[PDB]
Each structure stands twice: as C-alpha cells, then as structure tokens.
C-alpha cells in the first residue's frame, strides 16, 4: 500500500521532551528511524534466541530484559532495565 510505517512522530515527541527547541533534519530523521529499527531487530532477535535456548515459546519482559543486558553496554543496560521494569510496573498498576 501507499502508506509506509515509520517512527517519525514518536522520535519527534521524544526530541520535544528532551530539547524543546531543536528540530531534526529529514536525513537525521531517516537515520534515527533506521537506528530504532536496527536496535529493535537486535533486541528482538536476541530475545527470540533466548526463548529458543530455554525451550520457551513466548517472548516476555524477562527475555527482553536479558537481551537488553546482553547487547546494551552496562550503563545503558542498567538504566534501560530499571526504567523498563518501571514502565511494566506502571502498566500493570494501571492495568
């Protein structure tokens, strides 16, 4: 179909949250979108391998957490893991 799927709007929302005066070029937009896609593919492939190694048939928060601890460097992994459990906690509390 004519539509294409991208993370433009979400990246912009994060950018406005961080630096609420700065724009982003279209080339830099394409780079950020491909970066999000590449990191998603890495984490998802590692979680798939993780679920396959332990004879599991489901990707859960535990497999995503372990895949983050595997690929992300330690400071990035630590802060992303703590926030991710905070986000999962917020989602379960609100249901």
């Amino acid at each position: 179909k004519t539509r294409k799927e991208s993370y433009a709007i979400y990246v912009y929302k994060v950018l406005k949250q961080v630096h609420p005066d700065t724009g982003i070029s279209s080339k830099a937009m394409s780079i950020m979108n491909s970066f999000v896609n590449d990191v998603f593919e890495r984490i998802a492939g590692e979680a798939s391998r993780l679920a396959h190694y332990n004879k599991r048939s489901t990707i859960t928060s535990r497999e995503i957490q372990t895949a983050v601890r595997l690929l992300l460097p330690g400071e990035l992994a630590k802060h992303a893991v703590s926030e991710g459990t905070k986000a999962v906690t917020k989602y379960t509390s609100a249901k």
Partner: protein, 82 residues
C-alpha cells in the same frame, strides 16, 4: 559496455579520503592499492545487492537492497531505510 572506470576514482579523491582518515603523507602506489581494495569491496557489496535484487525478481537495484547487502557483511548503514 562501460570500461576502464576504476581510474575514475582519481588520485585527488584517494588523497581526500586519506586526509579524512588523518593520513598526512601518502606514497605513490597507495592509489593503485586503494583502487584495488575499493574494487574488491564494491564487488562484494554489489554481488550481494544484485543477489537480493534477483530474489525479488526486479531489474532495478533498490537502495534497500544495498542496505541489506551491507547489513549482511556487518557494515550496517543508517540513512536509507531500516
């Protein structure tokens, strides 16, 4: 049939590529060596991209084909699609 287009990667182009790499002084055979290295790299990436193209039954090498070719060798490239 295009021929002798490897010399189109001129000597000043190789010197600019070296300057961006931090190279201060260049020998005289570095140009031929770099043309050979670039030819090998381009052959590998273009072979992988033309394979990706032929699989999709297309005749036009898409930029996403080149991105997948680069990803296959581990030389991931951002800015032409994910």
């Amino acid at each position: 049939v295009l021929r002798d287009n490897i010399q189109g990667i001129t000597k000043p182009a190789i010197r600019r590529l070296a300057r961006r790499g931090g190279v201060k002084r260049i020998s005289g055979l570095i140009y031929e060596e770099t043309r050979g290295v670039l030819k090998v790299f381009l052959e590998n990436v273009i072979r992988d991209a033309v394979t990706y193209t032929e699989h999709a039954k297309r005749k036009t090498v898409t930029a996403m084909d080149v991105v997948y070719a680069l990803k296959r060798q581990g030389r991931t490239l951002y800015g032409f699609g994910g």
